[PDB]
Amino acid sequence: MAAIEKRQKEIADGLASAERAHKDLDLAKASATDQLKKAKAEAQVIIEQANKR
């Protein structure tokens, strides 16, 4: 459906495509969480949530 009949090293496209996406989403989520936490904590005072321990 994607590759008709022309492709050699797909790992490359998948690496850059998966890397750029993973990094993008990661930075996005992190930025949001940090931004929200910062704003909230700044509003007055709010504890933090433990995702692990």
Q: What are the CA-CA distances from residue 44 to residues 9, 38, 39 (Å)?
A: 54, 10, 9
CA 25 to CA 42: how far, in whole Å?
25
Domains, the chain, ranges and CATH? 1-53 (6.10.250.1580)
Q: How far apart are CA 46 and CA 40, in angstroms?
A: 7
Rounded distance, CA 6 to CA 33, Å? 42
Give the residue among 51, 49, 53 at the shortest CA–CA distance from 41: 49
DSSP tag of 7: -
Chain breaks in the chain (C to N over 2.5 A) after: none
